[PDB]
Amino acid sequence: MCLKLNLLDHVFANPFMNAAGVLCSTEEDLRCMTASSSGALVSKSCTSAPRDGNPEPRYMAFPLGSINSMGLPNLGFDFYLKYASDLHDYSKKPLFLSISGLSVEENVAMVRRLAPVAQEKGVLLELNLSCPNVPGKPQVAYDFEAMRTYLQQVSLAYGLPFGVKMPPYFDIAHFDTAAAVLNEFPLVKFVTCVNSVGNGLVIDAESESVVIKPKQGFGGLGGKYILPTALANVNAFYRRCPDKLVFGCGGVYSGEDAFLHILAGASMVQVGTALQEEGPGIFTRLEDELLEIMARKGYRTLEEFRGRVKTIE
Amino acid sequence: MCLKLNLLDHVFANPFMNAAGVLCSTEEDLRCMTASSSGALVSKSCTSAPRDGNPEPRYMAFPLGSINSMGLPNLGFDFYLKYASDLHDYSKKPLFLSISGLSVEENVAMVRRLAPVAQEKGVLLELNLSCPNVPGKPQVAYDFEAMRTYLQQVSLAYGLPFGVKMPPYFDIAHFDTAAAVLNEFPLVKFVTCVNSVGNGLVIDAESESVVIKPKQGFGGLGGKYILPTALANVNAFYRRCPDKLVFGCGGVYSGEDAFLHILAGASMVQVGTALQEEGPGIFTRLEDELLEIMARKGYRTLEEFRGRVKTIE
Ligand SMILES: Cc1cc2nc3c(=O)[nH]c(=O)nc-3n(C[C@H](O)[C@H](O)[C@H](O)COP(=O)(O)O)c2cc1C
Ligand SMILES: Cc1cc2nc3c(=O)[nH]c(=O)nc-3n(C[C@H](O)[C@H](O)[C@H](O)COP(=O)(O)O)c2cc1C
Ligand SMILES: COCOc1ccc2ccc(CCc3c(C(=O)O)[nH]c(=O)[nH]c3=O)cc2c1
Ligand SMILES: COCOc1ccc2ccc(CCc3c(C(=O)O)[nH]c(=O)[nH]c3=O)cc2c1
């Protein structure tokens, strides 16, 4: 009875990892994520130069989830690269590194220099496609030319296995169009569904005011709010992309939540809001809880039920 | 103190109404809503010809909301017109008739016939833009060129003030694009944000099965999952649409949920999932609660705080 996985030519103690941006920005966060019992970790999405991100308050959590416009605060690509190559203990867990450049050019520059470290050290690229593109156009994944463009360019630049990180979609034509694009590109070996549910609005009834400062209080949503949306996307992409791995992310608080992800077709399972709110000690609970469920049903390995969600007659 | 208002040359006792879909398909349903305390009511979206809809189960509710792929079951537009025409008691409350034909032609056919009654009776048109096409192309609203056609054509054929049911958007550029489309049309006197959050997927851990039968489990989401998304859209369209009313829909379970909708700029506030789950008694509760919040804060009229959410700094 176990949680172990082998994929992307790496061995994982379990399927649990943090979500990009959560408890991963600093050498402290990273070391801590490593000391945790997560199966893997991923580094805060990075740009070429260091960033301050947006004004505070910019994250707020609630019984039902969280809202954010961090604005991509991060220590700059050089820091995350030195971490991959010099600092991270790969004997503990695989490292993923997440890049979120503000243009296609910026993203090519980084992967060119990552590629040698990716080859030698084994760190794995999660390209963040829910990244802003020219103001007045939709974020990259909502713009299927920009996405085709970004992936040709990065593929050529990097020439190695890597995954992408997708925003949620809500039409079938959007699921159909998005997977066909990703299918064109044989080096995209995993797909992470999903990023935050874009541009929600949280209002406080007592103060009659928005709760985050940037973007008139408009921001990305996660947590309990988004689980169904996250499970739909995972299962949609798992069905449409059989030569690729889907990584599940969206409202995981419990073993059960992760079990549903895995049932939908998830291979790795990421925690954002819940992790942010509960702390790295969440990972041992999640493991135990999933394992208790597997036991109740006599499941002995993840593969016994991944993607095995049933439909109705 | 009371929550009376005047919109679109009609008086409402309060700002509450069902959402299209809920408690409004049969003549029983409509007599029921008319006998409720709702300020108004809206008919199940209809097509030219009666529809059986999708295989059951096609709707499910859980503590955090609901999922549906009804597939547009309705008695057919001839029945709803007769109800508008000979049966509804206008002394009791305003009626709204919702319309969701499969083609722009199907919609042009219904509205021409609806205009003489709208003039004669005062019934209000809510065109549903979450309708087919196709498959192979996104719903009308997620497709800004079709939306402009549909509006052109209906605007030409109806020629009276009418309103529009909008799916949720998740990106600023879409909010901008969407709004500029609806602003083209001086006849679109009101917007209803939002319709269900498209294509979520609820899975049941015990049976390891999806919960609605249509579309391999995939269907629209309502309830407590969708409130901030509904509030992002009410607010977003209130700012961009200064000559239109905004109607709020999504995640209303309480006076506080309605209050938040009004703050974002809502004039009418709609209830679907809660109404489905609690019954029309909900309107007296919701009234009391909102009225209590108002009394506590020192507000006398809806106009005092509509659209008045505070941003930070
Ligand atoms: C504070 C915060 C920062 C985030 N930063 C990133 C990021 O830098 N790159 C990225 O791809 N996703 C980022 N995300 C998205 C999360 O990784 C995840 O997709 C989303 O929050 C849903 O996860 P959850 O619902 O389990 O919280 C961030 C989310 C939060 C709340
Ligand atoms: C069972 C059901 C049927 C619905 N039918 C329609 C419909 O015919 N036309 C429409 O515009 N919206 C329809 N809706 C959408 C609702 O009117 C509303 O936009 C959505 O459910 C969010 O509101 P809620 O959170 O109060 O449930 C339906 C929703 C449900 C749950
Ligand atoms: C070019 O101007 C930069 O300003 C912004 C504004 C909003 C942003 C939202 C998300 C992000 C990037 C990555 C990210 C973030 C984040 O760092 O804000 N938050 C998320 O919930 N998901 C994410 O993928 C950058 C932004 C930059
Ligand atoms: C052309 O084939 C018709 O089959 C479908 C399939 C999915 C549909 C989804 C929504 C709807 C329409 C109206 C509607 C419905 C509904 O009747 O399913 N449910 C909602 O939550 N919101 C709605 O606006 C019709 C569908 C018809």
- Candidates B208, B256, B263, B306: best to mutate against A (most CBs of A within 10 A) is B208
Position B161, amino acid:
P
Q: How far is CA B104 from CA A301, B21, B116, in A?
A: 52, 21, 20
The answer to whether A199 touches B176, Cβ cutoff 8 Å, is: no
Of the candidates A73, A66, A46, A69, the residue with the CA atom closest to the CA atom of residue A57:
A69
**How many angstroms separate the CA atoms of A80 and A110, rounded?**
11
Q: How far is CA A27 from CA A30, A96, A100, B34, B38, in A?
A: 5, 14, 19, 63, 57
**How many angstroms separate the CA atoms of B27 and B78, rounded?**
13
Six-digit token pair at A61?
């959590």
Distance in Å, CA B198 to ligand 4 centroid: 10
CATH number at residue B24: 3.20.20.70
> After what residue numbers is chain B broken, C–N > 2.5 angstroms?
none
Position A303, amino acid:
E
CB contact under 8 A, B232 and A200: yes
* Ligand approaching nearest to the C-alpha of A223: 1
The answer to whether A255 touches A14, Cβ cutoff 8 Å, is: no
Q: Is residue B128 exposed (0-12), middle (13-18) or buried (19+ Cβ within 10 Å)?
A: buried
Q: How far is CA B123 from CA B82, B83, B115, B119, B128, in A?
A: 12, 10, 9, 8, 16
* Residue that has been written with the tokens 């463009």 in this structure: A149
Q: Is A89 helix (H, G, I), strand (E, B) or coil?
A: coil
* Pairing status of strand A162-166 against strand A124-128: parallel
B22 lines ligand 2 (CB under 6 A): yes
Domain count, chain A: 2
Position B307, amino acid:
G
Is B30 in the same domain as B14?
yes
Is B213 in the same domain as B81?
no
The answer to whether A6 touches A267, Cβ cutoff 8 Å, is: no
Is A98 in the same domain as A34?
yes
State the CB neighbour count (10 A cutoff) for residue A63: 7
- Report resolution in angstroms: 2.8
The minimum CA-CA distance between B166 and chain A, rounded to whole Å, is 14
Q: Which sign, positive or negative, has the C-alpha torsion A300, A304, A307, A312?
A: negative
Q: Is residue A155 exposed (0-12), middle (13-18) or buried (19+ Cβ within 10 Å)?
A: middle
Of the candidates B145, B198, B144, the residue with the CA atom closest to the CA atom of residue B176:
B144
Q: Which residues contact B278 (CB under 8 A, 6 or more apart)?
A: none
State the CB neighbour count (10 A cutoff) for residue A240: 17
Six-digit token pair at A277?
């709110």
* DSSP 8-state assignment for residue B30: H
Six-digit token pair at B143?
């497709």
Domain that holds residue A313: 1-53+72-196+223-313
Of the candidates B83, B100, B105, B112, the residue with the CA atom closest to the CA atom of residue B141:
B100
Q: Is A165 helix (H, G, I), strand (E, B) or coil?
A: strand
CB contact under 8 A, A310 and B137: no
Establish whether A6 is an annotated binding residue: no
**How many angstroms separate the CA atoms of B46 and B107, rounded?**
10
- Candidates A201, A261, A306: best to mutate against B (most CBs of B within 10 A) is A201
For residue B79, the surrounding DSSP H or E stretch is helix B77-82
* Residue that has been written with the tokens 């369209």 in this structure: B237
Q: How far is CA A254 from CA A39, B92, B145, B205, B254, in A?
A: 16, 49, 43, 12, 28
Distance in Å, CA B72 to ligand 4 centroid: 5
Six-digit token pair at A172?
């079938």
Of the candidates A231, A216, A223, the residue with the CA atom closest to the CA atom of residue A264:
A231
> Nearest-5° angle of CA A264, CA B166, CA A216?
85
CATH number at residue A212: 2.30.26.10
Of the candidates B19, B13, B3, the residue with the CA atom closest to the CA atom of residue B253:
B19
Given 3-state DSSP classes, what are the helix, strand and coil percentages for chain A, each rounded to the nearest 5?
A: 40, 25, 40
* DSSP 8-state assignment for residue A68: E
B227 lines ligand 2 (CB under 6 A): no
Active site residue B193: no
Is A40 in the same domain as A24?
yes
**How many angstroms separate the CA atoms of B305 and B294, rounded?**
10
Query: Is the peptide bond between A63 and the residue preceding it cis, with omega within 30 degrees of 0?
Result: no
The answer to whether B271 touches B22, Cβ cutoff 8 Å, is: yes
Of the candidates A154, A231, A219, the residue with the CA atom closest to the CA atom of residue B231:
A219
Is B123 in the same domain as B213?
no
Distance in Å, CA A278 to ligand 4 centroid: 39
**How many angstroms separate the CA atoms of B70 and B52, rounded?**
9
B296, B302, B306, B310 alpha-carbon torsion, rounded to 10°: -20
* Pairing status of strand A197-201 against strand A188-193: unpaired
**How many angstroms separate the CA atoms of A201 and A191, rounded?**
27
For residue A248, the surrounding DSSP H or E stretch is strand A245-249
Six-digit token pair at B90?
């206008």
Is B271 in the same domain as B291?
yes
Tell me the chain B residues in contact with residue A55 when contact means C-beta distances shorter than 8 Å.
313
Is A153 in the same domain as A17?
yes
Is B167 in the same domain as B259?
yes
Of the candidates B285, B229, B283, B298, the residue with the CA atom closest to the CA atom of residue B260:
B229
Is A97 in the same domain as A218?
no
Is A128 in the same domain as A228?
yes
The answer to whether A12 touches A6, Cβ cutoff 8 Å, is: yes
B164, B167, B169, B170 alpha-carbon torsion, rounded to 10°: 160
Domain boundary among A222, A239, A259: A222
Q: Is B165 helix (H, G, I), strand (E, B) or coil?
A: strand
Is B142 in the same domain as B18?
yes
The answer to whether A220 touches A200, Cβ cutoff 8 Å, is: yes
Is B156 in the same domain as B181?
yes
Alpha helices in B135-281 (DSSP H): 144-158, 172-183, 227-239, 255-263, 273-278
**How many angstroms separate the CA atoms of B294 and B287, rounded?**
11
Six-digit token pair at A290?
């999933």
* Residue that has been written with the tokens 């049941």 in this structure: B204
Six-digit token pair at B294?
């108002």
Query: Is the peptide bond between A123 and the residue preceding it cis, with omega within 30 degrees of 0?
Result: no
